[PDB]
Amino acid sequence: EDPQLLVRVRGGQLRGIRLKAPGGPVSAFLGIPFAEPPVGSRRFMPPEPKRPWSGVLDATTFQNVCYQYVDTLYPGFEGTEMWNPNRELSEDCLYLNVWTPYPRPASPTPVLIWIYGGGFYSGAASLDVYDGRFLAQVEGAVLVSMNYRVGTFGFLALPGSREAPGNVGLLDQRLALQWVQENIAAFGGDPMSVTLFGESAGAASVGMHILSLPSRSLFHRAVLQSGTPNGPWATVSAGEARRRATLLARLVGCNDTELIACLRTRPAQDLVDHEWHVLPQESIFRFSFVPVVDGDFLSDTPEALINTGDFQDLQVLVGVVKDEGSYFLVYGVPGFSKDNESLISRAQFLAGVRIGVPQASDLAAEAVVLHYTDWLHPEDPTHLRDAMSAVVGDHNVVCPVAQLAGRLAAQGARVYAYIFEHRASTLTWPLWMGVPHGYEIEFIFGLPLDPSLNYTTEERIFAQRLMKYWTNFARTGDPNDPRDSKSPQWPPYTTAAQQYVSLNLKPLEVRRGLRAQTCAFWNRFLPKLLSAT
Amino acid sequence: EGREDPQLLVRVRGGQLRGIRLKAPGGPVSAFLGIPFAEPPVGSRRFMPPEPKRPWSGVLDATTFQNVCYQYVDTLYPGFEGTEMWNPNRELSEDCLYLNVWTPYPRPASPTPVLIWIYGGGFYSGAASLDVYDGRFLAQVEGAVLVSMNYRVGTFGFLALPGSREAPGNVGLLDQRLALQWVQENIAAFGGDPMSVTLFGESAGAASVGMHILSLPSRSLFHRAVLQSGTPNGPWATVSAGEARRRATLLARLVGCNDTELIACLRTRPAQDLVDHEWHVLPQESIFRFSFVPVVDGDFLSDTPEALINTGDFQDLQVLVGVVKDEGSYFLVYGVPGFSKDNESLISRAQFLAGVRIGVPQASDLAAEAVVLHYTDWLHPEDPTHLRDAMSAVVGDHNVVCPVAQLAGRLAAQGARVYAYIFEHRASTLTWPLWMGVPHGYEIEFIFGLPLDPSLNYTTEERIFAQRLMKYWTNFARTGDPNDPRDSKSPQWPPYTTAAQQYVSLNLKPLEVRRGLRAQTCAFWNRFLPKLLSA
């Protein structure tokens, strides 16, 4: 019984495991329950605080992954499987992981809370890419990551109902955030320096925590990697949630109470089986059960909330990868594949766009097509493929990010923006996907520091830079290294200057305007188009 | 006859002409100026198609320019050269259907390719007698037979009650056509080769050239066309029959006037009254919109220029088209608040949004917002210099660059041999401010080789450049190809193609080949904007 690996949290005692990171040990407390297993009648329900336990809870092992669709598009492909649950699926999955330095830090340490992505339909805090050991070891970070319920389990909302209020996956996260507040000190986490970070749906979750009052007291800073609460995919209206919940109910043979009661009776996988059949359109980058504008967790739409919010005492790191959109093309856009070069035809581009912008009228879609077509090379398939990617990325991540960045900056938030452009040497996706959604995580998390992983030493150094930025950001709300000078400085993203840095192997390069023209199209014109059909 | 210069006496179908031996820098040219090609479209012939000039007796003196067609005289900057050079430089009269011929002197031995200039002036102004249209240089240096005609502008040329007999529309185009007919029959008398007739015109003249390309009966009258900064397609070069009707009847009301009764009344109105009200009939506050312009009558223009360029076969056709660096700047000073020649015209976002409404007067709120969204530099959305230049770009793009783009594209896609340029050289002599860059119409003096007149204060590179441009134009006139056939030492001007979209820069530097005529931005105007108006 290593006394460093033994912690009394509020619910009782935990025994962590001493994990080794390349530069020394780290105390990992994995699988800490932060809620009553949201099983049985607790399905679709807000998480209840975990009841205290007797003895020493073994917290040396990752707990189950929240029940979710396992991707099957390319079975056994590292590029997909690395996101697949790497633990048993269970609805009993409300667990969080805490990595701290070994020994437990002397003074309260900034806490980073990771919220995984997975389109609100998947993910697990246990995936290798979210291994917090590196940030814990190299940076002395207390790194927390929770599981939260995904898909129907996390986000089936019958808005207004008691039994499926929606947003429970976010409430899960909130609970983990509460758990951190009440408990992290026991690990030498500073509950007064908690930085959320997350990517993609995790970023959106972070943004939703930013935009939800009861969440705001549970952290001080946020990082949104490649995802925003605003935007086309991260939220649905109450009505749309109801529609999909209802549709799923039909699809599985099921007032809200009786509908939900029936849904409660359904084997987890049945819900998952029919989860995708509730999308109004053939889509990419769209997900059936996502946070719901419920008037409750989200008092208004994220757009509304980022327009009106006061974000004075908020610091935010946001950014995108170079190819936000490439990843998604292979999952429903004809002509795209990890296997060929996905050189697509004009027609496949126009059709691809209807799938990428499923909410688009013909005119909006034409607007998009006409905007993204390089008219010097209108039918060149490389351009069209890259444009399809661009469309999907801009529409879904880049422009939502720019919007968020701008709105937060305009409304007092200190904002740092980045574009991550380094394509992992070890990346199993084809070159044309460039730097896909999610492939910065391994770097932020510091996996290149694990020599056994085959990352180049330029990458190891890069990961170190990024872990420095992230944790400096966590420590201080400023990602710049004070123990460094002018190599060069990461400026706050402002609405005037619109500065952001490229994160890649070269030093920070400050760029201005995060696809400013194109985002103007998406953020300013596109809504005007559709808001007049 | 007998005591005078034997090389200035020419007979044409209507009779005997005495021209004038004019001094060009490199030697003399023959000019036959103010040759009537139509019956004065006066009195009862106002608004009527031109009738062929009835033969005259004796030797018609063709030694001076004739009347300029009755027109509005721009008075925004009185005494300012930049506006005065466009201003009529001969008496304003409805009796104005006269053309001009410059030929080498002595007249060319063998049939020489004919250049016919059609001046612009927004269809409400212009005159073949402006100094910038002086054919002497192209005649002297290039051996070209240059012909320019006056055609009726404004109401007299374009007021239309479509369907009516008495104001069928497009008569100013018909004057041009009549002058083309004149060149066909008579140009050989000057050593002109009626089988090598190139039209060229700038701005409304270019639209006019385009109209002729688009109009069957004109087709047999020329072989090649140059469209400088103007196109028959685009938002200003034509009006629907309905809109022409609307403006004609409104103009009528404005001056106190069944089509016959209306026209008859209009015919009793003094020219100046018509001119005085000409500009009050535009549907919106606007720039680069002109009240009386060619009408889609289903006669001269069998359908919209858009429709005819989209579906015509342009096999036999060589077209040189192009734009100036800054097509839009000129028009900004005449009715976009904020803009002036007298200052840097740094405007505000408000003034830009306002400008866009004036610059794209046909635009719905949504379409205007698109324009604004497109042209705003979102890094510097409030930046007055960018906004000022974006305003210019909006007007230039919308009215010239993108119409030219659609035109070049559609023409190339349909068999035409298209050569495309952007003229980027700002005359060292330009009296407009620097921000205006190279405004609309300021390539003309170079095409015409004015810089060759040593007394005109152009620089030597400008003289050389004029010569190059004159070469391009006359080569294109000769061969359908602006390139010098021997001289491959100079870079080649490739045809504009839909595939490669090549055009050249015309500036002091040797031909640089560029790709895509604002391809991205013209996709907005030519492909997106129409759709944004179909709802």
Ligand SMILES: NC(=O)c1cc[n+](COC[n+]2ccc(/C=N/O)cc2/C=N/O)cc1
């Ligand atoms: N719940 C379901 O049955 C289900 C869920 C998700 N998909 C598609 O998910 C594939 N996938 C997997 C991973 C990513 C994100 N990568 O960064 C994106 C995507 C899709 N984008 O449209 C199909 C069925």
Ligand SMILES: NC(=O)c1cc[n+](COC[n+]2ccc(/C=N/O)cc2/C=N/O)cc1
């Ligand atoms: N009734 C008309 O069509 C009309 C009459 C007079 N103007 C005076 O316009 C000023 N102006 C005068 C000269 C030029 C071009 N000169 O080369 C361009 C412009 C701009 N027009 O919007 C315009 C339309």
